[PDB]
Design an enzyme around this catalytic site. Structure first.
Site, PDB file in Angstrom:
ATOM      1  N   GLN C 231       1.000  -1.268  -0.005  1.00  0.00           N
ATOM      2  CA  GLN C 231       0.001  -0.090   0.105  1.00  0.00           C
ATOM      3  C   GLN C 231       0.892   1.345  -0.210  1.00  0.00           C
ATOM      4  OE1 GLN C 231      -3.045  -2.088   3.175  1.00  0.00           O
ATOM      5  NE2 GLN C 231      -3.327  -0.020   2.814  1.00  0.00           N
ATOM      6  N   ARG C 378      -8.874  -0.500   8.634  1.00  0.00           N
ATOM      7  CA  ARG C 378      -9.603   0.799   8.573  1.00  0.00           C
ATOM      8  C   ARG C 378      -9.703   1.528   9.980  1.00  0.00           C
ATOM      9  NH1 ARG C 378     -14.431   0.716   4.068  1.00  0.00           N
ATOM     10  NH2 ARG C 378     -14.091  -1.276   3.340  1.00  0.00           N
ATOM     11  N   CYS C 379      -8.215   1.550  10.690  1.00  0.00           N
ATOM     12  CA  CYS C 379      -8.490   2.426  12.067  1.00  0.00           C
ATOM     13  C   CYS C 379      -8.047   3.882  12.050  1.00  0.00           C
ATOM     14  CB  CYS C 379      -7.521   1.559  12.847  1.00  0.00           C
ATOM     15  SG  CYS C 379      -5.773   1.780  12.522  1.00  0.00           S
ATOM     16  N   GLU C 751     -12.852   4.986   5.937  1.00  0.00           N
ATOM     17  CA  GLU C 751     -12.708   4.295   7.160  1.00  0.00           C
ATOM     18  C   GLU C 751     -13.714   4.773   8.059  1.00  0.00           C
ATOM     19  OE1 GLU C 751      -8.415   5.686   7.531  1.00  0.00           O
ATOM     20  OE2 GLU C 751      -8.083   3.490   8.144  1.00  0.00           O
TER      21      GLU C 751
HETATM   22  N1  PCD Z   1     -15.591  13.093  -0.380  1.00  0.00           N
HETATM   23  C1  PCD Z   1     -15.078  12.180  -0.808  1.00  0.00           C
HETATM   24  C2  PCD Z   1     -14.197  11.035  -0.411  1.00  0.00           C
HETATM   25  C3  PCD Z   1     -13.817  10.118  -0.937  1.00  0.00           C
HETATM   26  N2  PCD Z   1     -14.490   9.807  -2.129  1.00  0.00           N
HETATM   27  C4  PCD Z   1     -13.916   8.648  -2.900  1.00  0.00           C
HETATM   28  O1  PCD Z   1     -14.253   7.359  -2.186  1.00  0.00           O
HETATM   29  C5  PCD Z   1     -13.003   6.413  -2.122  1.00  0.00           C
HETATM   30  C6  PCD Z   1     -12.399   6.326  -0.952  1.00  0.00           C
HETATM   31  O2  PCD Z   1     -11.537   7.687  -0.762  1.00  0.00           O
HETATM   32  P1  PCD Z   1     -10.970   7.880   0.874  1.00  0.00           P
HETATM   33  O3  PCD Z   1     -11.846   8.099   1.761  1.00  0.00           O
HETATM   34  O4  PCD Z   1     -10.180   9.151   0.439  1.00  0.00           O
HETATM   35  O5  PCD Z   1      -9.916   6.591   1.046  1.00  0.00           O
HETATM   36  P2  PCD Z   1      -8.608   6.114   0.284  1.00  0.00           P
HETATM   37  O6  PCD Z   1      -7.362   6.651   0.643  1.00  0.00           O
HETATM   38  O7  PCD Z   1      -8.892   5.964  -0.945  1.00  0.00           O
HETATM   39  O8  PCD Z   1      -8.796   4.535   0.691  1.00  0.00           O
HETATM   40  C7  PCD Z   1      -8.173   3.819   2.020  1.00  0.00           C
HETATM   41  C8  PCD Z   1      -9.277   3.270   2.960  1.00  0.00           C
HETATM   42  O9  PCD Z   1     -10.176   2.565   1.983  1.00  0.00           O
HETATM   43  C9  PCD Z   1     -10.897   1.363   2.597  1.00  0.00           C
HETATM   44  N3  PCD Z   1     -11.731   0.812   1.672  1.00  0.00           N
HETATM   45  C10 PCD Z   1     -11.197  -0.285   1.230  1.00  0.00           C
HETATM   46  N4  PCD Z   1     -12.085  -0.438   0.052  1.00  0.00           N
HETATM   47  C11 PCD Z   1     -11.540  -1.600  -0.753  1.00  0.00           C
HETATM   48  N5  PCD Z   1     -12.196  -1.878  -1.863  1.00  0.00           N
HETATM   49  N6  PCD Z   1     -10.375  -2.071  -0.764  1.00  0.00           N
HETATM   50  C12 PCD Z   1      -9.430  -1.690   0.485  1.00  0.00           C
HETATM   51  O10 PCD Z   1      -8.337  -2.120   0.562  1.00  0.00           O
HETATM   52  C13 PCD Z   1     -10.006  -0.897   1.226  1.00  0.00           C
HETATM   53  N7  PCD Z   1      -9.131  -0.294   2.369  1.00  0.00           N
HETATM   54  C14 PCD Z   1      -9.727   0.424   3.559  1.00  0.00           C
HETATM   55  C15 PCD Z   1      -8.815   1.275   4.312  1.00  0.00           C
HETATM   56  S1  PCD Z   1      -7.858   0.407   5.371  1.00  0.00           S
HETATM   57 MO1  PCD Z   1      -6.075   1.467   6.164  1.00  0.00          MO
HETATM   58  O11 PCD Z   1      -5.014   0.823   4.956  1.00  0.00           O
HETATM   59  O12 PCD Z   1      -6.272   0.106   7.972  1.00  0.00           O
HETATM   60  O13 PCD Z   1      -5.495   2.670   7.162  1.00  0.00           O
HETATM   61  S2  PCD Z   1      -7.590   3.332   4.975  1.00  0.00           S
HETATM   62  C16 PCD Z   1      -8.573   2.570   3.791  1.00  0.00           C
HETATM   63  C17 PCD Z   1     -12.069   7.260  -3.415  1.00  0.00           C
HETATM   64  O14 PCD Z   1     -12.191   6.841  -4.526  1.00  0.00           O
HETATM   65  C18 PCD Z   1     -12.575   8.600  -3.089  1.00  0.00           C
HETATM   66  O15 PCD Z   1     -12.249   9.318  -4.430  1.00  0.00           O
HETATM   67  C19 PCD Z   1     -15.282  10.512  -2.796  1.00  0.00           C
HETATM   68  O16 PCD Z   1     -15.913  10.431  -3.873  1.00  0.00           O
HETATM   69  N8  PCD Z   1     -15.756  11.687  -2.248  1.00  0.00           N
END
Ligand code: PCD
Ligand code: PCD
Ligand code: FES
Ligand code: FES
Ligand code: FES
Ligand code: FES
Lengths: 797, 155, 797, 156
Positions: C231, C378-379, C751
């Site tokens: 990433q 997604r913290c 997130e």
């Molecule tokens: N206002 C607004 C905002 C936003 N958007 C859209 O929606 C989407 C989202 O964005 P954003 O909120 O800025 O975010 P990004 O940077 O792109 O992404 C990242 C995130 O994302 C979520 N979700 C998801 N989904 C999918 N399918 N796959 C993945 O892998 C994943 N991972 C997860 C995580 S764990 Mo970390 O790494 O624990 O911190 S951080 C994270 C993109 O296309 C954009 O452009 C719109 O339209 N409007």
């Protein structure tokens, strides 16, 4: 130590070894025919057996039923897409697949798509075609005759073309430059005058690797990727997008490693278009790779100029005027590579290295039943012809005045103080020092001793050999660029460079040019190395991929060093200006209190306080000084203010066997001045290669056509290419006269050896016969042709 | 089709081939040994040169089927454990290549020529390399490349 | 024609279909395991069967003798390259291959390289390893006891770490924020005071595609190319460069299509390092692709925070202070993804959507015999834990004061007019309007009627089900960027974009981020479409290739829209300014006599005089106006001035079966406000995915260890992931409160659904037991656990 | 020892020789480069490897290639006919039924068969009928819409 640090960079001026060698010496290069893609089919082309005639019928059934054959396409399949014809760089149109008739022998009539090249070859033989022969036009003069056959029935009723009015159906254009009124007046009153007709025969660049491509249109993604032997991938992309309707961003053209281009791979050939079309239709990769016979017979040829030169002068040898008239044979379709506004290239550079006050030149293009082309084989856009013309005339003038061939040149040279010099044709020569170079060459070969040996030999009527001395002092014009006057299909002739420095100090760079063996991956790295204090070894350069490299116009006309070399230096300098700014912030001093020393910015006075480019690079990624964006990179598109004018002084000594007509090059001395030299080792290789092409052209190459328009000697059986045995040992020398306007004072040089050597060979051969009144002998200076002359002038045996 | 067993670069290759298949295409297309190149159809260029049973041969004028039981060496097999062969080193050091198209053939030729004649004169080199054409170098640096390899081989 | 031209662009605000889909719906995506290279071998890993112990001996002979196996490597082969240990994003070090001992079960001990994955797997079983078991440490509290075993013997004698002093051998760091004294003073005298311990269970992001790579070191060119599930490919390139000694410009990292990342693919795993090393040693490609069991067992986990929350207030529910103490379980090595200055991420955002005048938090991380991680799934850098803490605490306060849960929030919300609001922890919330959004949700679900229904069920002692209403009003912090504050291993957390306009009007764009499914190739194109008047369909965007894309920090913490989204708009605006300058030249008028209308610059007062972006693009390549370089492109690196603060109001109704303990989600309403919306369709998808993950975490996911340290339920046999049957129908809503500092006012949002939904589920389950005095119940809320609670509170059947 | 087999994939004969332990999923991905089908687990739960074998939806990671000698196998690469997307592919596209695309080939192959087993499915029937396929990105909501879209297109 500062010297040790500079040496470690392996930058400007160093004869460092090539970075690209590793892959090639191990067979890991990646040329077009090395490519294999999933589901890739092969294409072959059914070619015309006659030079001129209507197409009655093409039989596709036997080929189609053949196991392994997927398709057989003709011009009829190309019509709906409006692709049976294509625009050319010269503003004319060219047939992709012959429709109603064939205009030249070996022309593309149909194509077959098969599982491989073997089945493909068989499919071509199975395709039968019936024709109704038409009278063939081979001589340009016979082409302009009232009763001459109509070659271009597609242009019927037209009175003008892309380059002005047309006076006949086989007449393409007429172009002139200079002051005709002034020149005519000088010739009318000149005390001494000379005039000579000379033919610059049609020859072929014949790159070892022929033309080819792997075209892949992906119906799933809706885009086209084409790997191609192209010297201008970016414009190819633009053109292919226009002709296909596929948005440009979805078209990707990539020039991989190319086994030599030599001007042969600048344009788009019917083979490429057909492969692209076939791929779009079949939804899979299609490979097309031509054979040697197809390359020589149908790809871009060079020369084919019939020239009438005249020189006006005073008794002491000072040149008063120059008048030239030319008939140019462009084949069936004008596809001559050139900037849109110059149908005869930069032929008006024919004033040479001389201060000629008045001059005029006129060039008339003509259609004939032959393959298109004209500009290729290190010509710099008709400069090969211009230099040949002027140097030949100067020799004739010298012989008439009984004046030494070097002396008449020294007397007519543009002086060092006259630069920048504006010629009678309008070119602004950037810089030169012709006198110093001439003296250097004459002394090195002991010219006077040579002339004395020659005199002693001519005195003995029993001498078994003739001694000839040829000397050429030329001025090249390279770096096609000023967008105001130079453009390819509407795109200004600029070029570009993008450099990006990484967090750890190394870098990647991409240019709009594309090497074909000239070493850009090494030399480009050296330029940047000196500009940023980063060793060239870790500055990775790439070209050819339109999806990654900045838009450029490709490489031809020795434009790389002049145009791209400038953009490279300027793009690096933008990065240097930011680095100074960052260094000043890190050192808590002002920018003006800093001095750049090879690879670091040091505080004036205190040497211990400094920051390397590496330190600066990290800082750029870590935390940019207030007001600055993170990162350390730059882009630059350079529209050149003028061309670059490198020069040379070549001398050749030959001995002709009176019993057989065999000419043996005894010695060849070549001095080139291309300004600041990036890599002397690489320049030497370019010279050696160009002088060899020169030898091949002057001494053995030609493309004769019989009365029925059949091309003779279109394979290596007869088409001359010298081996290590025929190639003489070359002696090189140089001087350094920088281009004032260029960022690094570097001029182009790759075409100079070709341009200058050809007339040096003719000069030496003619000089061998000069004492019996011979003023000129047309190339090639074959043993057969030279013997014929020996017999004519009673010198045989 | 004829089943053959060719020793290519030290490895045995048992393949079924059509009699008309040129050795150059067999190497490039079947084995993907794309170092060897094609520059003509008349047998002049020598860009297809490979070593077969102790001799330099233009693979475009030899059938793959004729190689049953043969020992074939291509440019990919010159380097030993990644260490360049003297001829590869000579060409690199002496700038004996530019576009690199004739290089594999030149190297394969030089590899054998230096065994045929270990102390060649310039004339002998030019004559000994006559079967290989080059469009870029002008041959001068190639002569030096071969001379460099000759010195290193007797070192 | 104006409204129609804008509509045709399919830019900002349009719910245009995805450009990515085409390849994915036809199986033409390109994920790491789809890659096949010439000579590619396969690598598998020999893993630790125990949780803690010394390595007595590793047996390689049987594996090496097996046909198809090329090599078997251990830490001994890594030592000479100083690679048996590697640096982590948290400033600690992690074992690449177990050297003297193993710190966690399933840890990497040795690797085998074979012809394919089948032989490789066999080879792993052939390798026998002898161990000396050591006492295991699985509880953080037990880890800090005097007699507790020494896990990290490598840092024995160190009294400080990367984040301050260390008090115990298993103690990693102690971090705090806010005003301690001021907070303690409020709590010492406040009339209302509540306290609550809660555990945020260790869970796994479990992306459908596991981690893997194809490392390829080319000994011929000397460069490294590795395709990987990363990433942050650019950061990986810099790190790989420094650890290997290979110059960065010769290292190419490429993240192709990734089958989901979810924070699981931010870091570098020993598997990648081993493949790279093996590739370097074998001089050929090495592929590594882990199985699901390995992914869940050894890659980055999420949460594992033991939290003690406290709230001080007046009897009307007005919060006076907040005090928090947390014990963080980071496993064997601290490899927690976070900016170097935040070992506890942005946990100090735990003041939530409330104006709390005094607050303080303290986090203590400790070592245990488990896999590294903590930040993922997604913290947003511990925001999940921060939001869960405050929302659970507010519910606890509401229950002690017998005050409605919606009312107490509306009472403490930061008022709209208070923005930009600076919290007790120092964050400057950009903008917000919580009251309006809350009212919208309450009215939409008829909150008072829900409470009325709940009151009725509670009345009847024999109601077969318990009804719980959960409500969460949260504030997110996304767009990790201010370089002075945020950096990843020293690299400022900026991002970038580079746009190049082609001669014909279409364009190519590359950013330093990397999508894993969130639609960047579509949305990024939409941003540019509106800025430049070019349909998004022809604006091709790419990410992931370090050799082509501008340097960036990758995609995580929902930073793409805030940081890259900004760089994109600014880069486009650099092009737009130049386009105006060009348009003015063509139209022969002053720049500000021009008006921009959707896709063209027109002269004020004269609608007939205009130039489109296509007209301008061509002019840029054809003839640049004096003082301008040819071309039309720009690059921009954006260092954000502040984070972005989106918010949301989430409501969930659950019905619990008293007889089985199984919870059924009756309704889930989610309102998110992420400012200006680029593509609503894409936003909705991110919400659905996020809410589903939340249900997975709160209702079924966990990673239990037995007393011996064995990880239980580490495969899909027991690790919970809902199918279409378990996933409730989501109801989504929104309001638009733009970010004032952002170039287009857009905030991150991806997130938000994960961060907010989790405490919403707990809130609903706990609220179902509230009438019997339940203040909190630890996740997961499985039938089994919920039943144990029904039983404990005499509510069972 | 490798067993020589010929399996019909997308209507084309695939003649190969593989060890008996070769899972069908690796056969398709490794031997034929039909890399659409994916691997998301080792316990047979995810369904990312779902292909249509002899008229039925089958998780190719739990079936031997050698048990397919003569069988008719359909993979995502073979759904589109003459370039025109199958109703199922069009449904997933129009309804935004995919984000990362990893579970997609399996979802498409399952939906292709499901719609033949049940031409007019209710939402509950769809969720239950697609229950053997896991998705980490979509939350399934749009996937049921995609299937509803395809169900409708096939009836018109
Ligand atoms: N206002 C607004 C905002 C936003 N958007 C859209 O929606 C989407 C989202 O964005 P954003 O909120 O800025 O975010 P990004 O940077 O792109 O992404 C990242 C995130 O994302 C979520 N979700 C998801 N989904 C999918 N399918 N796959 C993945 O892998 C994943 N991972 C997860 C995580 S764990 Mo970390 O790494 O624990 O911190 S951080 C994270 C993109 O296309 C954009 O452009 C719109 O339209 N409007
Ligand atoms: N001063 C100086 C200059 C130059 N350089 C170098 O040298 C080279 C070269 O350069 P230039 O001159 O600039 O040139 P370019 O552009 O690059 O090139 C091109 C040319 O080149 C030649 N040569 C050659 N070589 C080879 N190898 N290959 C080829 O292909 C070829 N081709 C040819 C031709 S023809 Mo045309 O196209 O008809 O117009 S043009 C031509 C390079 O590397 C550079 O850097 C140096 O060093 N210095
Ligand atoms: S290809 Fe020219 S000799 Fe073989
Ligand atoms: S280096 Fe190009 S043909 Fe020899
Ligand atoms: S790979 Fe998970 S069910 Fe087949
Ligand atoms: S779209 Fe990513 S797992 Fe389904």
């Amino acid at each position: 130590d500062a010297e040790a640090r500079e040496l470690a960079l392996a930058g400007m001026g160093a004869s460092r070894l090539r970075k690209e060698d590793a892959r090639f010496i191990q067979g890991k290069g990646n040329y077009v025919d090395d490519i294999k893609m999933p589901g890739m089919l092969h294409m072959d082309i059914v070619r015309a057996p006659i030079a001129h005639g209507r197409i009655k019928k093409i039989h596709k059934d036997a080929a189609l039923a053949m196991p392994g054959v997927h398709a057989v396409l003709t011009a009829e399949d190309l019509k709906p897409l409006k692709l049976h014809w294509m625009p050319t760089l010269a503003g004319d149109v060219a047939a992709v697949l012959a429709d109603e008739k064939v205009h030249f022998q070996m022309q593309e009539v149909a194509i077959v798509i098969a599982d491989d090249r073997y089945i493909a070859a068989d499919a071509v033989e199975a395709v039968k075609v019936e024709y109704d022969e038409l009278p063939v036009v081979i001589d340009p003069i016979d082409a302009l005759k009232p009763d001459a056959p109509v070659l271009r029935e597609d242009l019927a009723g037209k009175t003008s073309g892309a380059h002005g009015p047309r006076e006949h159906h086989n007449h393409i254009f007429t172009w002139g430059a200079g002051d005709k009124a002034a020149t005519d007046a000088v010739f009318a009153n000149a005390p001494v005058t000379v005039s000579q007709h000379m033919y610059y025969p049609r020859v072929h660049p014949c790159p070892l690797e022929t033309c080819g491509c792997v075209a892949s249109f992906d119906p799933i993604k809706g885009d086209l990727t084409t790997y191609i032997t192209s010297q201008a991938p970016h414009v190819v992309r633009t053109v292919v997008s226009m002709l296909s309707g596929i948005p440009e961003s979805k078209v990707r053209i990539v020039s991989p490693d190319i086994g030599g281009g030599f001007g042969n791979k600048v344009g788009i050939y019917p083979g490429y278009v057909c492969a692209i079309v076939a791929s779009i239709v079949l939804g899979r990769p299609v490979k097309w790779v031509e054979d040697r016979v197809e390359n020589i017979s149908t790809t871009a040829f060079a020369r084919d100029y019939h020239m009438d030169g005249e020189l006006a002068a005073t008794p002491d040898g000072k040149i008063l005027g120059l008048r030239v008239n030319v008939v140019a044979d462009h084949g069936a379709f004008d596809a001559c590579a050139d900037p849109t506004k110059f149908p005869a290239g930069l032929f008006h550079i024919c004033s040479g290295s001389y201060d000629i006050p008045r001059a005029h030149c006129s060039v008339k293009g003509v259609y004939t039943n032959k393959a298109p082309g004209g500009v290729a084989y290190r010509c710099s856009f008709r400069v090969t012809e211009a230099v040949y013309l002027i140097e030949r005339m100067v020799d004739v003038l010298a012989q008439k005045l009984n004046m030494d061939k070097a002396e008449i040149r020294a007397k007519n040279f543009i002086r060092k103080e006259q630069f920048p010099y504006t010629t009678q044709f309008g070119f602004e020569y950037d810089s030169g020092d012709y006198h110093t170079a001439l003296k250097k060459v004459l002394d090195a070969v002991d010219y006077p001793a040579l002339r004395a040996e020659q005199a002693a030999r001519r005195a003995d009527p029993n001498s078994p050999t003739l001694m000839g001395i040829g000397l050429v002092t030329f001025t090249e014009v390279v770096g096609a660029g000023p967008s105001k006057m130079c453009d390819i299909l509407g795109v200004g002739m600029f070029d570009s460079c993008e450099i990006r420095i990484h967090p750890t100090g190394s870098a990647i760079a991409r240019m709009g040019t594309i090497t074909q063996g000239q070493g850009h991956q090494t030399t480009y790295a050296q330029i940047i190395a000196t500009e940023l204090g980063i060793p060239s070894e870790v500055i990775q350069v790439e070209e050819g991929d339109t999806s990654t490299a900045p838009y450029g116009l490709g490489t031809y006309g020795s434009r790389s060093t002049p145009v791209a070399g400038a953009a490279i230096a300027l793009a690096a300098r933008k990065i240097h200006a930011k680095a100074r700014k960052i260094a000043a912030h890190m050192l808590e001093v002002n920018e003006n209190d800093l001095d750049w020393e090879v690879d670091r910015f040091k505080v004036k006075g205190d040497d211990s306080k400094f920051k390397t480019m590496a330190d600066i690079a990290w800082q750029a990624y870590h935390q940019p000084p207030a007001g600055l964006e993170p990162g350390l990179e730059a882009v630059h598109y350079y529209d050149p203010p003028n061309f670059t004018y490198p020069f040379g002084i070549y001398l050749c000594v030959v001995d002709i066997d009176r019993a057989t007509g065999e000419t043996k090059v005894r010695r060849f001395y070549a001095l080139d001045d291309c300004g600041t030299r990036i890599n002397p080792m690489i320049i030497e290789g370019q010279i050696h290669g160009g002088l060899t092409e020169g030898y091949a052209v002057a001494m053995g190459q030609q493309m004769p056509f019989d009365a029925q328009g059949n091309l003779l000697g279109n394979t290596l059986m007869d088409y001359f290419l010298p081996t290590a045995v025929e190639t003489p040992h070359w002696e090189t020398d140089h001087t350094v006269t920088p281009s004032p306007h260029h960022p690094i004072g570097a001029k182009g040089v790759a075409e100079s050896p070709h341009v200058g050597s050809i007339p040096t060979f003719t000069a030496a051969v003619v000089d061998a016969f000069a004492h019996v009144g011979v003023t000129h002998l047309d190339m090639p200076h074959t043993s057969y042709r030279v013997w014929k002359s020996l017999k004519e002038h009673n010198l045989a045996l | 089709k004829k089943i053959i067993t060719v020793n290519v670069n030290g490895k045995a290759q048992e393949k079924a081939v059509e009699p008309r298949t040129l050795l150059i295409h067999f190497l490039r297309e079947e084995l993907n040994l794309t170092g060897a190149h094609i520059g003509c159809e008349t047998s002049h260029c020598g860009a297809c040169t490979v070593d077969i049973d102790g001799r330099s041969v233009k693979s475009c004028t030899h059938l793959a089927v004729q190689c049953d039981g043969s020992e074939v060496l291509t440019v990919e097999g010159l380097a030993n454990k990644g260490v360049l062969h003297a001829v590869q080193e000579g060409f690199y050091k002496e700038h004996g290549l530019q576009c690199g198209f004739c290089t594999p053939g030149m190297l394969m030729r030089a590899y054998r020529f230096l065994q045929e004649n270990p102390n060649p004169t310039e004339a002998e080199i030019r004559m000994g390399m006559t079967g290989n054409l080059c469009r870029c170098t002008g041959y001068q640096n190639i002569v030096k490349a071969v001379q460099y390899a000759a010195r290193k081989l007797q070192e």
